[PDB]
Design an enzyme around this catalytic site. Sequence first.
Site, PDB file in Angstrom:
ATOM      1  CE1 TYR A 186      31.999  53.035  26.055  1.00 25.62           C
ATOM      2  CE2 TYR A 186      32.840  50.834  26.427  1.00 25.62           C
ATOM      3  CZ  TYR A 186      32.321  51.781  25.575  1.00 25.62           C
ATOM      4  OH  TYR A 186      32.147  51.444  24.268  1.00 25.62           O
ATOM      5  CG  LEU A 187      28.796  49.323  32.530  1.00 21.35           C
ATOM      6  CD1 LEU A 187      27.518  49.157  33.319  1.00 21.35           C
ATOM      7  CD2 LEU A 187      29.837  48.307  32.963  1.00 21.35           C
ATOM      8  CG  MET A 189      24.478  49.246  24.875  1.00 23.12           C
ATOM      9  SD  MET A 189      23.490  49.910  23.521  1.00 23.12           S
ATOM     10  CE  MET A 189      23.895  51.646  23.666  1.00 23.12           C
ATOM     11  CG  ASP A 190      26.906  41.892  26.382  1.00 21.51           C
ATOM     12  OD1 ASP A 190      27.591  42.598  27.185  1.00 21.51           O
ATOM     13  OD2 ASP A 190      27.263  40.784  25.956  1.00 21.51           O
ATOM     14  CD  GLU A 220      37.235  39.954  26.061  1.00 20.43           C
ATOM     15  OE1 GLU A 220      36.602  40.487  25.125  1.00 20.43           O
ATOM     16  OE2 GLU A 220      38.065  39.036  25.908  1.00 20.43           O
TER      17      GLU A 220
END
Length: 286
Positions: A186-187, A189-190, A220
């Site tokens: 899971y990343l 988008m920035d 985070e």
Amino acid sequence: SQTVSFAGKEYELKVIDEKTPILFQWFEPNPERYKKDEVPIVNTKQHPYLDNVTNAARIESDRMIGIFVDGDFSVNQKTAFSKLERDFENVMIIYREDVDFSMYDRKLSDIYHDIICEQRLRTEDKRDEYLLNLLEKELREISKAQDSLISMYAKKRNHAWFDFFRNLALLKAGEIFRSFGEGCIYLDMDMILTGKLGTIYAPDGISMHVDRRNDSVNIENSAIIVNRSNHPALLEGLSFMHSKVDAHPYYDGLGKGVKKYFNFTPLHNYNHFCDFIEFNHPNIIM
């Protein structure tokens, strides 16, 4: 062979293999902020989120790249989403309303029942009569149509909307894409990929972004790696989510479950847990 330890307990480094798909998420409160025929995802110079997502799919040509979306998109945006799917062999759009998350739901009445009980289990005169009155009245007003934690969050249009369904997507992991294996990367988008990720390892197959900027160290939720669906560190987070009706900002059920799973208490060493949990990658600018 390769084990790490935290808080006096040993954990296997588990492999997050090279067919693990990548998931990005965009939940759009205002689909009317976009021109005709454009993908209702932000893509400015400041926030080039769509290009970042297409950049990643370009680079990771042999993995499935997912975009988990929600919002009251028009037929025209649906079309532009479908065009995006077709311009990229390895991108799929995953609409929230199309995913069965029912396995993670809980009835609102069940939750109120718990809260109300725990309140009454207090001495005759240190109890919150104001709170109990509002809770019991809130309990009475739930239709059997809308006695769903999930259905209540699907209606919201703020950050709690995003975070709630982020947690559920992380539990589904690779299953949300129903080649692709069972984990999920899971990343945010920035985040910008600059090369291939290859094979990743995580303690018990879970890791999380640790932001190490400004000589500060913060865990985070912007990047999370899991090696499998229904990861138990995330089921701990589900338990927290199920104990509240309207969880407050910064309750952070996700983070609380992970820390609980690894016995990271408010008295343990914050920096050591950051070292241990961190997902960093030379080829992702985070």
